[PDB]
Write a protein that binds this ligand. Structure first.
Ligand SMILES: O=C(O)[C@@](O)(COP(=O)(O)O)[C@H](O)[C@H](O)COP(=O)(O)O
Ligand SMILES: O=C(O)[C@@](O)(COP(=O)(O)O)[C@H](O)[C@H](O)COP(=O)(O)O
Ligand SMILES: [Mg+2]
Ligand SMILES: [Mg+2]
Ligand SMILES: [Mg+2]
Lengths: 441, 440, 133, 154
């Protein structure tokens, strides 16, 4: 007879401003736009309907200890609601389960006109259940013998339409010319104009030729993204039997579950998985609704991506400067300190899991390198697609320029200094001198 | 023909004279241009989702850009209509479709907001998909249930229930009259409810309640898991317990895992109920994201048997006319364009099976007339709180919800039915004042 | 040149009575019967030779942060030595690994005539890696 | 499977003790640093090197990294000395299945030998490990970690 049937406000049981968060709680920071109810009521509905509650009181609440399992709105600062989830609510080693609760139904509630997950404190006891990356930053530098500089790559263009053999010709030239890696476009999978076995095989021969001829480690991120986890595994294994040490995977369009099988297999096969964030801007971009990219970054690192696209800031795709710095630290550091200037609402322990490479890509050229190095430092990939194959003299010469630009700035000299000795780079500097994009801090 | 440097996207990708072909995949994008005219912004979307980049590359001469490129062929206000040649797509892969159509273009500085409103998937591509294994008709056959909606309900509280308690509720609600019960979307395997315990106990309840009612009964075991391999494992266990159905969070797990799960379930002669957890992260705001109608087309092609479609009148957002278009997408062979229902294109489904629409969330007996008006017979109505929130328990709640649906489905009113059924009279009284906003 | 070759007492680096145990540390309670050395030295040898140390200083200690990974005798009450092990020292989900370190070689040391592991605090972050029944 | 005589045959080393050494510090070394020590000590004259008994797979040294780098060092040092060289990769793990997995990887790297904590893992797992190693033509070096818990006092 503790059972009082009927509807009550969610805040009765889910608003607990006196609650003291525990080290084992999963904490969430939600930006809320209430619709037709209090800010407190809005927060309490998000907490209730992502933990234990529903719209009306159920007799079955007496079959368990709700006060133990329920999520708790413990703080509200402005339109930011801080909510704590007991550890027992989550399946171990499953971002998918985290998703199902934290972002499963609460973003479609009528009582909230907009909702945005800004950050999440994944407790260390749940972090330790995840594998994290197989290879990560340091070991990739060991595998390839590349130190004290950013690594440079580039998407083959045009995005679609190139035959497998024409693809390998572009790969050979830009690798020979100075790129460390080349990659499939995120939407190159297996299509009538380029079936995936043909592309994989020709690309890996171009890779091997370039590496032998230059006496430098080289690679191409074969896209194994496919409509099926099984098919993706089949393409990863083929890439392995070709001798590739790396592939790419559109982890958001394929999904975190698939991504988990793929990282697992890649890891047993001693291969890097480059993670392309295709689709993310569908829900990471608008500031008032969606999932912040930093949260995706945490989930990707734990699940085990070796690389992750994190933006350019200065290129063609939207991205804020300080926001990008916080994502960078999330992927590279062991312990990240709360800093709202970088969009970090919580301290985050990664428990010794390996680091992932930040990847800067999209509409960047030689002139951006000084800024990109100020943003990322050495532990990152800079990718130049149009910035390589757009060179007036072709792909090899664009690679020469980009490699010469990155080596120079990375060592302290200026594009103008490096340009004295490199004509390929003078043409790149001249072609794109007035090609700039909006920069937001 | 190679001229280096940056040229405007519209030079090559704005083609208002272009005649779409039946093989073309067509997209309707709602665009908010940023620093560029609408035409340039629509041309950037078309280029950077097909063949283009920010600067002209010499390698454009190595293929036929005019053949493979997407074409902005019409603009109506803030809506750009873009045609994509069939050859751009991998067969039988929503994943690939997404990779191109929503891959990167939603993050461009040259648009402030972007929404994919609808997509015309050409029949030649449609025919490479399997579509649902079971669908609507065969489920009515398997369960011998005709000429009415099927009634279900989520077990509550969402989390925290022992597997044994779970079975007690499943027993009470299925015995009371529910056709199906289900795990909550976030019930996977957790310290309070490990999946093997819950599945085993839940299927015992199903079978005890079916035998005692002489009626087909089911519970949607949630096989959602952190990996496709583990989900397949949980699916295999449910199959061996005798279950004819499971539940899957197809968007949070992902379309790649969903494809493998649907394929195995179809080999095991099982229904897969698809929960759209996470959808509202990008389907809600009219400003930006992917309209749910596109998600429904993708799910039905990939092979989901059921799909949550909204209630309109319940606790979650959803407009009436929009929900009617989503419903036709799931059940009909050929959908006619109709902008009142948010449908920008005719869609042929090529004889693939239909998916059950699923109305769920914050609904009770009073909502049932509106619900049948929206959905008619071929749908699931799901009462979670509306069943286990009954003053007398889950059995009485199922008794009431079954009688309210049976009654209205026949032609009687709630109060006519209520006079014979006291459990329903208590539901009506309890929730008479519980209403949510209703947008048409 | 932080490398000082030769033998030092284990207590120099493994006796840390000021150390504050953390929730992530694996804690051990050892009952020690010292043989030919101090109680403190006996405890510090158990800590050293079940974490990072050996009988003589190695140049390779400079290739990692010993102060982070080393076990620490943080309390001695009578013949009970309380020792803390950083979480990073253990393989996840492996009692076998716990055994290999905590009870692997230290019970046969000449500097201890008898040794008994009385209890162990397995930190919650390591518990969660196990399935249990 | 192998024993004393055949190991002398496999390694072509006769009429003297074989010389080895444990990598130190016991824990905390990166897999790459580990390989540097294995290289230096085998090149200097050691016949074999070995993981410490408690080096399994840990946040500071995941087993696949360490095994791979360690066997590279073995082969670099063998080729430069024209002498057989080996490192006892520790396949001790929390389950027999996982130990067999690590044994299989060491075999595929070309290693002719592994290490196993036979008492802490247990005699049941040891039986399976010895059987597979004998099918893979490998030496299993047995570390008696934990023995002194019941072998010490008279
Ligand atoms: O498709 C493209 O546009 C790219 O190949 C860039 O080509 P260019 O090098 O020619 O620009 C990358 O996929 C994007 O950078 C992804 O964006 P983000 O990195 O933000 O995810
Ligand atoms: O978790 C929940 O809220 C529910 O169990 C409803 O429970 P009640 O019946 O107790 O309200 C359903 O999963 C949501 O309706 C899904 O939303 P949708 O169908 O809109 O995708
Ligand atoms: Mg790309
Ligand atoms: Mg639910
Ligand atoms: Mg040892």
């Amino acid at each position: 007879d503790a059972y009082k049937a009927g509807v009550r406000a969610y805040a009765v049981d889910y608003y607990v401003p006196d609650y003291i968060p525990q080290d084992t709680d999963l904490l969430c920071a939600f930006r809320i736009q209430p619709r037709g109810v209090d800010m407190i009521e809005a927060a309490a509905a998000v907490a209730a309907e992502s933990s234990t509650g529903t719209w009306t009181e159920v007799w079955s609440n007496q079959l368990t200890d709700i006060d133990f399992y329920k999520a708790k709105v413990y703080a509200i600062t402005g339109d930011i609601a801080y909510i704590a989830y007991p550890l027992d609510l989550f399946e171990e080693n499953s971002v998918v389960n985290i998703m199902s609760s934290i972002v499963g139904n609460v973003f479609g509630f009528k009582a909230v006109g907009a909702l945005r997950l800004e950050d999440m404190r994944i407790p260390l006891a749940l972090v330790k259940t995840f594998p994290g990356p197989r290879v990560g930053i340091y070991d990739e530098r060991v595998w390839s013998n590349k130190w004290d500089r950013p690594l440079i790559g580039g998407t083959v263009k045009p995005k679609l339409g190139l035959s497998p053999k024409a693809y390998s010709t572009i790969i050979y030239e830009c690798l020979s010319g100075g790129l460390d890696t080349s990659k499939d476009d995120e939407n190159m999978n297996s299509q009538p104009f380029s079936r995936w076995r043909d592309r994989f095989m020709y690309a890996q021969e171009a890779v091997d030729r370039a590496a032998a001829e230059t006496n430098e480690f080289k690679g191409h991120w074969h896209n194994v993204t496919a409509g099926s986890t099984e098919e993706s595994l089949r393409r990863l294994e083929y890439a392995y039997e070709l001798g590739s040490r790396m592939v790419m995977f559109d982890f958001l369009t394929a999904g975190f579950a698939a991504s988990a099988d793929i990282f697992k297999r890649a890891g047993e096969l001693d291969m890097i998985v480059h993670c392309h964030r295709a689709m993310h801007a569908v829900f990471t971009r608008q500031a008032n609704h969606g999932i912040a990219m930093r949260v995706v970054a945490k989930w990707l690192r734990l699940t085990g991506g070796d690389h992750l696209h994190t933006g350019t800031v200065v290129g063609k795709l939207e991205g804020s400067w300080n926001d990008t710095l916080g994502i960078i630290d999330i992927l590279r550091e062991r312990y990240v300190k709360a800093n709202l200037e970088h969009g970090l609402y919580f301290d985050q322990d990664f428990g010794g899991l390996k680091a992932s490479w930040p990847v800067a890509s999209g509409g960047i050229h030689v002139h951006h390198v000084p800024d990109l190095l100020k943003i990322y430092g050495n532990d990152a990939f800079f990718l130049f697609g149009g910035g390589t194959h757009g060179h007036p003299d072709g792909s090899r010469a664009g690679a020469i320029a980009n490699r010469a630009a990155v080596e120079a700035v990375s060592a302290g000299q200026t594009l103008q200094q490096a340009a004295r000795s490199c004509p390929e780079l003078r043409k790149s500097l001249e072609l794109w001198a007035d090609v700039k994009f909006e920069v937001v801090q």
